[PDB]
Amino acid sequence: GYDRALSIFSPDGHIFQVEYALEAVKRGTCAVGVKGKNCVVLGCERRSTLKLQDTRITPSKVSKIDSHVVLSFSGLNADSRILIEKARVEAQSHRLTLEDPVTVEYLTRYVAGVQQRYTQSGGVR
Amino acid sequence: TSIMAVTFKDGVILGADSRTTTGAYIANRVTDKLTRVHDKIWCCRSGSAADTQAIADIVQYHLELYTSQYGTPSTETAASVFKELCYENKDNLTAGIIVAGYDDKNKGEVYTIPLGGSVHKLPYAIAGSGSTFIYGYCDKNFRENMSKEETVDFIKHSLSQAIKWDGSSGGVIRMVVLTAAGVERLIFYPDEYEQL
């Protein structure tokens, strides 16, 4: 199998592949989160360079991970689907084994863990 | 067990090894397997020791009572009594018996009674676990109307080979000679027959 170390340290102690991934995030449409006293609001930018779009069927920017937790993102759209699927599977797995839905912190910790893993595993970006 | 009986010019000779085993243990290394049911009618026993001793004792009784009433029984008659016990009780017996005897009218005769209780009159007969290994040798070397010395040699050589290959056979080679002259017992020790 393809084992090449793509994420490595540079002489100044930087991992450029991780830093270049942040540059992809910088390019993505803007997302914002604000929590009130009894709510949280997620706002997302839609670039109007694409009209003749069918808004009924086009992938929406905010995704339900469970009935009580949502996830929005900035960056590569295709990449986000992989994280969303993994998070949704883990949410159901947690309900199955702990008999309680995930806390927001736990779900965050899981997604963040997947992202870290892809920074020191061979053959992946 | 290795047993045989062979007719010859002057009569018949019975031969046997002396080994009795319980599994791989030799319970008796000097067994006498040549048993007398009448003066000049003897038998070689193979199979269950309990069964063949029981059968032989009953036959000896039958022939003793026959003799008191009708005089000396023929070898055919003795074989018939053996057969009757073996055939009718075939479900409950494990016995393979060779019957050998000397008449003056019929001379030397040999009858073999295998497991099922059938009877077969033969010039010579071999039986027991050791006999399997000497079917070839005996068929090639047996002649009719041999002398006493030739027949002793034939049996000595035959049972020597049976003992050599069969773990259930061994010890001394016992023989009983049946002729007009009488009844002679012979014994041959390992140091003799092993060098043949």
């Binding site: 339900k64 469970d66 009935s67 949704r88 949410a91 159901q92 309900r95 199955l96 | -």
Partner: protein, 195 residues
Amino acid sequence: MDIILGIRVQDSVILASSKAVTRGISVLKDSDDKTRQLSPHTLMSFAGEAGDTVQFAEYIQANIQLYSIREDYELSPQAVSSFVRQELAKSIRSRRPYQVNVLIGGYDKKKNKPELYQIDYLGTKVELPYGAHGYSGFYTFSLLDHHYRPDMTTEEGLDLLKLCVQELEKRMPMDFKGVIVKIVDKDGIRQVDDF
């Protein structure tokens, strides 16, 4: 597990399941709920080998809930029953098969029709107006064959169900400690708390 019954009437599906759990010599519990909600308008009752029943039911529940979240859509009762059948058909040629029989009661919101599916541990599926597993059908089907009408109300269905349970309580040797009854219709799933 023991008795599980189902009946599809005009506008709903009713599932009745026994409350007893017996481990050999003693009845360990008399309030056991032998059912799992797979989606808001789909209920599954189950019976079979100890352990495997709850393990299979919760596994199916987890999978349907996952589909619901992924697509933001409730699968039809027919689609759920087909998914369940395949899982049992797969299981029967496994190293250690799930020994679990199920009834799936669902209300199809698209067709506005109640639907009842009976599936055994081999993966044998049939759609029925009424069904059962084990010996339950042997005592109840002659009553259902006589009284059942496709235009029955929910109340009439419950009354016919009571007659079935009464016949079971009379002629069955085992004490199954009554039944929990649940109704599936256009408004979802609810439990009848007095039966």
